[PDB]
């Protein structure tokens, strides 16, 4: 609950460009792929 926290939200959002770039190079839709990254990670803590 601070302005430093609002910067950390943008820090977390901008860090997701690496799997987004992998989706565009592979031709897959980034939102469909990144939606699966969000769907499997709450249970899968690593190696996903």
């Amino acid at each position: 609950e601070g302005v430093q926290a609002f910067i950390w939200q943008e820090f977390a959002s901008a860090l997701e460009v690496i799997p987004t770039t992998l989706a565009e190079n592979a031709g897959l839709n980034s939102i469909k792929v990144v939606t699966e990254l969000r769907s499997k990670h709450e249970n899968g803590e690593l190696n996903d």
């Binding site: 302005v3 609002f6 839709n29 939102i31 469909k32």
Partner: protein, 62 residues
């Protein structure tokens, strides 16, 4: 007739983000972009007036 002063922009912005929560599809980020784009005019008024933009939009949104 409508009351301006940044009220027309923010009142049209929060509803678009609310619709995106159930109308997700592929265009979920498209509604979020238009919701954030409408709020820029209040932030433009915050820059010219010399006030904190984040505190202003946080108080108006809440």
């Amino acid at each position: 007739v409508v009351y301006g002063g940044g009220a027309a922009e923010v009142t049209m912005s929060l509803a678009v983000s609310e619709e995106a929560d159930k109308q997700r599809g592929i265009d979920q980020y498209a509604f979020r972009g238009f919701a954030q784009a409408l709020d820029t005019i209040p932030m433009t008024l915050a820059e010219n007036s010399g006030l904190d933009p984040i505190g202003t939009l946080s108080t108006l949104k809440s």
